[PDB]
Scaffold this active site. Structure first.
Site, short mmCIF file in Angstrom:
data_model
loop_
_atom_site.label_atom_id
_atom_site.label_comp_id
_atom_site.label_asym_id
_atom_site.label_seq_id
_atom_site.Cartn_x
_atom_site.Cartn_y
_atom_site.Cartn_z
N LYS A 180 13.70 -1.82 14.74
CA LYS A 180 14.10 -1.11 13.52
C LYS A 180 12.83 -0.59 12.88
CE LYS A 180 14.50 -0.79 9.09
NZ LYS A 180 14.08 0.50 8.51
N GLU A 183 11.97 4.51 8.00
CA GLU A 183 12.88 5.61 7.73
C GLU A 183 12.13 6.94 7.72
OE1 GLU A 183 13.52 2.69 4.38
OE2 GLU A 183 12.30 2.52 6.20
N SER A 234 3.81 -3.58 4.90
CA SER A 234 3.41 -3.98 3.56
C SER A 234 3.19 -5.48 3.46
CB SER A 234 4.47 -3.56 2.54
OG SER A 234 4.28 -4.22 1.31
N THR A 235 2.09 -5.87 2.82
CA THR A 235 1.89 -7.28 2.53
C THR A 235 3.14 -7.86 1.88
OG1 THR A 235 -0.50 -7.40 2.45
CG2 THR A 235 0.72 -8.84 1.02
N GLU A 236 3.52 -7.30 0.73
CA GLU A 236 4.57 -7.92 -0.07
C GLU A 236 5.92 -7.89 0.64
OE1 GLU A 236 3.82 -9.62 -3.33
OE2 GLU A 236 5.85 -10.33 -2.83
N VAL A 237 6.19 -6.86 1.45
CA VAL A 237 7.45 -6.81 2.20
C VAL A 237 7.45 -7.85 3.32
CG1 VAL A 237 9.00 -5.38 3.59
CG2 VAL A 237 7.81 -4.37 1.65
N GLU A 256 1.66 -8.41 10.49
CA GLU A 256 0.40 -7.70 10.39
C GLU A 256 0.44 -6.77 9.20
OE1 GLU A 256 -0.55 -6.09 14.13
OE2 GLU A 256 -1.74 -7.86 14.73
N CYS A 290 -4.08 0.66 8.76
CA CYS A 290 -4.27 -0.79 8.68
C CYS A 290 -5.76 -1.14 8.62
CB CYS A 290 -3.52 -1.51 9.82
SG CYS A 290 -3.83 -1.07 11.60
N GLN A 337 2.68 6.88 -3.58
CA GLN A 337 1.33 6.34 -3.60
C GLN A 337 0.29 7.37 -4.03
OE1 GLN A 337 1.80 4.72 0.77
NE2 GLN A 337 3.35 6.16 -0.01
N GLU A 382 -6.36 -2.59 -2.48
CA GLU A 382 -6.32 -1.75 -1.26
C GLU A 382 -6.01 -0.33 -1.73
OE1 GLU A 382 -3.04 -5.04 0.13
OE2 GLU A 382 -3.28 -3.27 1.41
N1 LIG Z 1 5.41 1.06 -5.86
C1 LIG Z 1 4.23 0.48 -5.69
O1 LIG Z 1 3.70 -0.21 -6.56
C2 LIG Z 1 3.49 0.73 -4.40
C3 LIG Z 1 2.15 1.08 -4.42
C4 LIG Z 1 1.53 1.47 -3.26
C5 LIG Z 1 2.19 1.34 -2.07
N2 LIG Z 1 3.42 0.82 -2.01
C6 LIG Z 1 3.99 0.40 -0.69
O2 LIG Z 1 3.69 1.37 0.29
C7 LIG Z 1 4.60 1.13 1.37
C8 LIG Z 1 4.52 2.21 2.41
O3 LIG Z 1 5.49 1.92 3.44
P1 LIG Z 1 5.11 1.03 4.70
O4 LIG Z 1 6.15 1.20 5.73
O5 LIG Z 1 3.69 1.28 5.05
O6 LIG Z 1 5.21 -0.45 4.18
P2 LIG Z 1 6.56 -1.23 4.05
O7 LIG Z 1 6.32 -2.64 3.66
O8 LIG Z 1 7.46 -0.42 3.23
O9 LIG Z 1 7.05 -1.17 5.53
C9 LIG Z 1 8.34 -1.74 5.61
C10 LIG Z 1 8.87 -1.59 6.99
O10 LIG Z 1 9.87 -2.60 7.17
C11 LIG Z 1 11.10 -2.14 6.67
N3 LIG Z 1 11.36 -2.77 5.40
C12 LIG Z 1 11.10 -2.22 4.18
N4 LIG Z 1 11.46 -2.97 3.18
C13 LIG Z 1 12.00 -4.09 3.78
C14 LIG Z 1 12.58 -5.25 3.25
N5 LIG Z 1 12.72 -5.48 1.96
N6 LIG Z 1 13.04 -6.16 4.13
C15 LIG Z 1 12.91 -5.92 5.43
N7 LIG Z 1 12.39 -4.86 6.04
C16 LIG Z 1 11.95 -3.97 5.15
C17 LIG Z 1 10.99 -0.62 6.56
O11 LIG Z 1 12.13 0.03 7.08
C18 LIG Z 1 9.67 -0.32 7.26
O12 LIG Z 1 10.06 -0.40 8.61
C19 LIG Z 1 5.94 0.99 0.64
O13 LIG Z 1 6.89 0.23 1.37
C20 LIG Z 1 5.51 0.35 -0.68
O14 LIG Z 1 5.88 -1.02 -0.73
C21 LIG Z 1 4.14 0.65 -3.17
#
Ligand SMILES: NC(=O)c1ccc[n+]([C@@H]2O[C@H](COP(=O)([O-])OP(=O)(O)OC[C@H]3O[C@@H](n4cnc5c(N)ncnc54)[C@H](O)[C@@H]3O)[C@@H](O)[C@H]2O)c1
Ligand SMILES: NC(=O)c1ccc[n+]([C@@H]2O[C@H](COP(=O)([O-])OP(=O)(O)OC[C@H]3O[C@@H](n4cnc5c(N)ncnc54)[C@H](O)[C@@H]3O)[C@@H](O)[C@H]2O)c1
Ligand SMILES: COc1ccc(-c2cn3cc(-c4cc(OC)cc(OC)c4)ccc3n2)cc1
Ligand SMILES: COc1ccc(-c2cn3cc(-c4cc(OC)cc(OC)c4)ccc3n2)cc1
Lengths: 479, 485
Positions: A180, A183, A234-237, A256, A290, A337, A382
């Site tokens: 998966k 998007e 994403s770290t937090e995700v 990672e 990364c 961002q 970052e």
């Molecule tokens: N709003 C803010 O404060 C802020 C600031 C800077 C960057 N960002 C981050 O930049 C990221 C850029 O996207 P990215 O893909 O590099 O990182 P990401 O963490 O969004 O990547 C998530 C990946 O896993 C999936 N995923 C997303 N959310 C999920 C969840 N809750 N549970 C399970 N799977 C999930 C997505 O489909 C994608 O495949 C954004 O997701 C966002 O979090 C946010």
């Protein structure tokens, strides 16, 4: 040039599928804002389906399970061959989908995809357990069996690569997968599903379900019949995915994530090599990577000429079209961002940091910060954009503590001609990879991955195989 | 030794004993006599924070510990194992006092297991080995297997000192530092070892021990942002909690070991007398309170009855009583929650329709003891057959084909261990391959060696312990990639 997108559906059992909801989402093109096509929007029922298809094709006695360990690599070589064949198709799609320079996507992304695939083709019949010395009358040994249905969830910055880095090892060990993709960037993943049926993997060995994070991805990380997940992003995700895995199924998770990855220049370092590689690791793939350099420590003996030679570089690098065969740097993907970066550009202004060149858009024009300290936001955080925050230091033991201070740690690059300074630094730095007089020197055979909060587990190495095996011990006693 | 007094009940930080930053204390009881041994300090987050900052510093770069030579680390571990052997009968007593283990069992299994484990991993210290990797002509590339940092360890009451050692030995030979929390039911021996840690000459702050309660000290360790790695042996329930907490904050690396629905297949062509003896001591060892206890016992029709009949005489013949007696095999159960909870599961058996071939109720009410109990004609959907019973209960089942029982055993979410008994080369191996279990013994039971890894498949664990594989869980891989002119 103008290339048609041919695959847009959920891939399960080597047949193309529609949402159980018939819903659809629509990936666009960061280069020229333009809806590419409409992809099916999968979701829990779609996942639920593929995860079953994976369990079946993984079931004992399946055509997959019974394959001779080397024929597992035969396929993996076949798939790499195909990727090789339709190579520029993929580079094209990956460019349309992310806005990378078409060459960057052709010579890095797909070169990495092709190499990473064949490397793990090698390992398929070399996954060896141990036979263990125990007692006189006891035969004891271990097998390294495959874990089962494996979850892959990847970022938009290297979609097909970040995807292969999990698919290649997982399949050689003989798991089945539910994939998966982002998007923002689901196209190349869906293509590769054609190549997977063509190379002739059994049906249900790989399954793709494009869609959204909180919907599809979150269905994976919680699903009771997925035995392992790999996540890059994403770290937090990642934090949540680890949580959900823990709440349901106790599946094995490997992550990672990002980092404030340091870049240390000593007084005796080659300056043009240091300055230029410090540039390749702040501004490559538009700064979203990364491996990007949040911090650049430089010894006082070469500070100004470092800072000076650096600003010369930023202004000469060409921007514009991605299909440009004269460019280095296309656009960003999600403006979400874009806002916080050229906000951060003011963070350093506000805390007293000289801005030696740049600081706004036109894309953003490459930026450079001297006089930066540790506590400034622009060195605490970052940055997914070009922001080169240059610090200063007297001691080797000084920059050791400074660079190690953050909770992240996925990359460090050191620059020095000195043998003692090279090794003393590498041993000290708490970083998954320490590069020396080079940057972004990834090889399919050296493990990548995070220290501390940049993830756990490794990828790309013989060490990758660990994350896709469950270790069984047999202990036999004779009479 | 009989009226031996407890010398160690305080918190061990930087090789100094301490009181609760709070002052509170808590008692540990002797389950055999149901009376209180003594009171130990009850720690909490401010205690844990003290110990972690201690460990954080003993691991700091250039600590006596970090500048230490690699073989010397090995020597210290070999040194600590010496002390254990010396003070072996002190510890084994303490362990029986706290748990009602038959004392001889603790001295010939538990403590034996501890010294052997300390020595294996002592031997791995100067043999932790990374790789050098071919890449391009102009590149040197290689990997280092650095230590992780401050490692939490949290262990149960069923093997208090052994479950602690299984984590301490690898982590300590690999160059980490530790914050240990034992079970509240059984804190005595974890503290004693801390005395020995100091005598064996470990640098202060390399091991630290904070006793106390699961929610209080436990969770404070699992969430602590400066602990870099946890090991947990315990329940699946608490297991999901601890991995969750580590995920929520600091993304620590977590390895988990937590029980199972451990199948014990007995094929028709089986030394039956061996099968009853092992699938008996397998079920009932350590009062049936074991990570690797035998729960579902599958037997082939051709031998179903006479197995059951052979199991039931063993059950009555097997001696229960004083742990300090030299003829005991089954001391008491651990506490009131367990004893009632196991007594209740018995009734679900009676009330779900299963022949109560033997025992079936507790005996001599003034003790915490339970009549050794067998069941027959136990079906799958049955309660005694679906849940971990942590006590003497032997539910036997009928099965027909191999492929029937392969499917039936991999039916649970658990899978820590499995035994198979047959003389048939192809049956043993076909079963061994297809079972989804961590260990699979064959013509034996409870055959753990330090050289062979032990851990769960599926929801029974993540990662392994006791093997060259344990080193994985206590080291972080780094890649060094040098480029030349
Ligand atoms: N709003 C803010 O404060 C802020 C600031 C800077 C960057 N960002 C981050 O930049 C990221 C850029 O996207 P990215 O893909 O590099 O990182 P990401 O963490 O969004 O990547 C998530 C990946 O896993 C999936 N995923 C997303 N959310 C999920 C969840 N809750 N549970 C399970 N799977 C999930 C997505 O489909 C994608 O495949 C954004 O997701 C966002 O979090 C946010
Ligand atoms: N007084 C009491 O609360 C008490 C006494 C006896 C029995 N019990 C219960 O008996 C059962 C025996 O289980 P077990 O010891 O085999 O394994 P367990 O999972 O209950 O405990 C394993 C270890 O985890 C630690 N722990 C417990 N809860 C925790 C949490 N929420 N967060 C972090 N660490 C935690 C504990 O110190 C314990 O040593 C448990 O339900 C136990 O709590 C509790
Ligand atoms: C300055 O000019 C150069 C042009 C090009 C290169 C260069 C880098 N490359 C990287 C890979 C590769 C493989 C990966 O997975 C195995 C991951 C990854 O990420 C970086 C890259 C393949 C080919 C390649 N060529 C160097 C210098
Ligand atoms: C009847 O003939 C025999 C032959 C051999 C043995 C035998 C097996 N043993 C296992 C241990 C041990 C070690 C552990 O950690 C390393 C964990 C553990 O828990 C169950 C047990 C210690 C001594 C031991 N002896 C017995 C009887």
């Amino acid at each position: 040039r103008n290339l048609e997108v041919k695959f847009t559906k959920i891939f399960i059992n080597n047949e193309w599928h529609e949402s159980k909801s018939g819903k659809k989402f629509a990936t666009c093109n960061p280069s020229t804002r333009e809806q590419i096509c409409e992809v099916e929007e999968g979701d829990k029922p779609d996942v639920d389906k593929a995860v079953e298809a994976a369990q079946v094709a993984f079931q004992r006695g399946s055509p997959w399970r019974r394959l001779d360990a080397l024929s597992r690599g035969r396929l993996l070589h076949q798939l790499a061959d195909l990727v090789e064949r339709d190579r520029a198709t993929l580079a094209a799609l990956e460019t349309m989908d992310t806005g990378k320079p078409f060459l960057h996507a052709f010579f890095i992304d797909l070169e990495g995809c092709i190499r990473t695939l064949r490397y793990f083709a090698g390992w398929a019949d070399k996954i060896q357990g141990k036979t263990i010395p125990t007692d006189d009358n006891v035969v004891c040994f271990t097998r390294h069996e495959p874990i089962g249905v494996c979850g892959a969830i990847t970022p938009w910055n290297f979609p097909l690569l970040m995807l292969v880095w999990k698919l290649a090892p997982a399949l050689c060990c003989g798991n089945t997968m539910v994939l998966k993709p982002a998007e923002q960037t689901p196209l190349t993943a869906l293509y590769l599903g054609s190549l997977i049926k063509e190379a002739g993997f059994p049906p249900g060995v790989v399954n793709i379900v494009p869609g959204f994070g909180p919907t599809v991805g979150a269905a994976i990380s919680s699903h009771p019949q997925i035995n392992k997940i790999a996540f890059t992003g994403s770290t937090e995700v990642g934090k949540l995915v680890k949580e959900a895995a823990s709440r349901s199924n106790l599946k094995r998770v490997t992550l990672e994530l990002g980092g404030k990855n340091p870049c240390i220049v000593c007084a005796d370092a080659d300056l043009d090599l240091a300055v230029e590689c410090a540039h390749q690791g702040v501004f490559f793939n538009q700064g979203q990577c990364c491996t990007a350099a949040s911090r650049v420590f430089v010894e006082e003996q070469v500070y100004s000429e470092f800072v000076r030679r650096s600003v010369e570089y930023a202004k000469k690098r060409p921007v514009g079209d991605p299909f440009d065969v004269k460019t280095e740097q296309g656009p960003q993907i999600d403006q979400k961002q874009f806002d916080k970066i050229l906000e951060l550009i003011e963070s350093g202004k506000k805390e007293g940091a000289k801005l030696e060149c740049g600081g706004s858009a036109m894309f953003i024009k490459p930026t450079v910060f001297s006089e930066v300290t540790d506590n400034m936001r622009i060195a605490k955080e970052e940055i997914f954009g070009p922001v080169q925050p240059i610090l200063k230091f007297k001691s080797i033991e000084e920059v050791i503590k400074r660079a190690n201070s953050t909770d992240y740690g996925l990359t460090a690059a050191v620059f020095t001609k000195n043998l003692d300074k090279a090794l003393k630094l590498a041993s000290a730095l708490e970083s998954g990879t320490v590069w020396i007089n080079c940057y972004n020197a990834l090889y399919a055979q050296a493990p990548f991955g995070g220290f501390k909060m940049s993830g756990n587990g490794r990828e790309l190495g013989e060490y990758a195989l660990a994350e896709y095996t469950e270790v069984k011990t047999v202990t036999i006693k004779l009479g």
